[PDB]
Amino acid sequence: NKNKKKKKTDFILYRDSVLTWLLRENLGGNSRTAMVAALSPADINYDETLSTLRYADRAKQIRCNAVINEDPNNKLIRELKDEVTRLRDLLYA
Amino acid sequence: NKNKKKKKTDFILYRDSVLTWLLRENLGGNSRTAMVAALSPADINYDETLSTLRYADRAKQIRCNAVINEDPNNKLIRELKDEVTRLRDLLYA
Structure with a gap:
């Protein structure tokens, strides 16, 4: 996002556990999402709370990249309909 | 009819079967011929109809040939693109 834009090919590995494998799309792809981190306030639970905080911050x-998709034929037909509408408005004026 | 050069007499041969032998005056000479072939519409009776069409396919x-049309969405896209091209021309001209 910030470095240059080269699309260095370091790929994420999701085939390790079934949990990551089945949540392939939600973690990244055509889905938008939220993380809900619960916390225990007790002083004895310090390290686990810090781990939860750090990984929530990382998840931020x-x-x-959620995107809506439909049939490309219908989308192209609608785009062409808008284009001909624009041209008709141009020549009618 | 095509080349004006009648093919000699191609002496037709009827003395081969009694049916064509008795009807020699009607097929040949100054005469006209017409044939009608019946066809049944059952999907079950396929090869009967196939044989009837094959034997009817003789005699001139x-x-x-076949035609086959194209995906309706593609035809609509082509028509829209042609209209856009005309209008762009309606704009250019």
């Missing part, structure tokens, strides 16, 4: 840095 | 076989 993640970008989602 | 007529050139046959």
